[PDB]
């Protein structure tokens, strides 16, 4: 409770397992629907990537979002994620789906939702479950798609920390008195 970093984190692990097994026999049953989870795995991580950076109150205005969005598009480009290039931006679709991570999210959500989950520690605790949940999807293809998945995975995580670290600097110069960042 005093270190949601480890506590709330371990609660997630359990949930993940339960589902892990739940949707494990189906993936091995047939080699196809498992590959569908690969595309959704990225997309879920992508719409969330943008949403995470966007929602973060410490990153509302000109917090480097423009570049953050393009980076993801560039990174998702090499991956080979289905999509299309519109004007000058690459985008797959509107929110993947998240039918797996959402299931474990519900279990832990109803369990934690406590003061420990309050602390901003839940931030870093982003690749904890994914690393696992996504590991399963890797089972259907832990060879290639895996290399691609593990890449876009760490790529996004570092993309946020790097973009956040920068914005954080701007936040320091933001506070003042008037016209701090109204951009009227």
Determine the Cα–Cα distance for residues 91 and 127; give it in Å rounded to an integer.
22
The tokens of 92 are what? 């797959």
- Residue 102 included in any domain: yes
The tokens of 27 are what? 């993936």
Name residue 86's beta-bridge partners: 89
| CB of 11 closer than 8 Å to CB of 111 | yes
- Residue 8 included in any domain: yes
- Residue 182 included in any domain: no
Determine the Cα–Cα distance for residues 31 and 121; give it in Å rounded to an integer.
38
Determine the Cα–Cα distance for residues 79 and 76; give it in Å rounded to an integer.
5
| CB of 52 closer than 8 Å to CB of 126 | yes
Q: Exposed, middle or buried by CB within 10 Å (0-12, 13-18, 19+), for 43?
A: buried
Determine the Cα–Cα distance for residues 45 and 76; give it in Å rounded to an integer.
11
- Residue 181 included in any domain: no
- Residue 125 included in any domain: yes
Query: DSSP string covering the chain, please?
Result: -TTTTTHHHHHHHHHHHHHHHHTHHHHHH-SSHHHHHHHHHHHHHHHHHHHHHHH-GGGSSSSSHHHHHHHHHHHHHHHT-S-EEETTEEE--S----SSHHHHHHHHHHH--SHHHHSGGGTT-SHHHHHHHHHHHHHT-TTHHHHHHHHHHHHHHHHHHHHHHHHHHHHHHH-SSSSSS---
DSSP state of 89: E
Q: Which CATH number do you get for residue 88?
A: 1.10.4120.10
- Residue 81 included in any domain: yes
Determine the Cα–Cα distance for residues 140 and 132; give it in Å rounded to an integer.
14
Count of helices and strands (H, E) across the chain:
8, 2
What is the span of the domain harbouring residue 127? 1-175
Phi/psi at 91 (nearest 5 deg)?
A: -150, 130
Q: How many domains are there within the chain?
A: 1
Determine the Cα–Cα distance for residues 119 and 135; give it in Å rounded to an integer.
27
Find where tokens 């949940």 sit.
133
- Residue 180 included in any domain: no
- Residue 184 included in any domain: no
């Amino acid at each position: 409770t005093g270190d949601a970093k480890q506590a709330i984190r371990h609660f997630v692990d359990e949930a993940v397992k339960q589902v892990a097994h739940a949707r494990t026999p189906e993936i091995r049953q047939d080699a196809e629907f498992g590959r569908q989870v690969y595309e959704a795995t990225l997309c879920a991580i992508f719409s969330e990537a943008k949403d995470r950076f966007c929602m973060d109150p410490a990153t509302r205005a000109g917090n480097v979002r423009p570049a953050f969005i393009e980076a993801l598009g560039d990174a998702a480009r090499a991956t080979g994620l289905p999509g299309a290039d519109k004007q000058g931006v690459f985008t797959p679709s509107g929110a993947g789906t998240n039918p797996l991570y959402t299931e474990i999210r519900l279990r832990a959500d109803t369990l934690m939702g406590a003061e420990l989950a309050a602390r901003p520690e839940y931030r870093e605790l982003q690749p904890y479950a994914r690393q696992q949940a996504i590991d399963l999807v890797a089972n259907a293809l832990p060879a290639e798609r895996s290399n691609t998945l593990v890449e876009f995975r760490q790529t996004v995580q570092t993309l946020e920390a790097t973009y956040r670290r920068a914005a954080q600097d701007a936040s320091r110069d933001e506070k003042g008195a008037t016209n701090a960042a109204d951009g009227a």
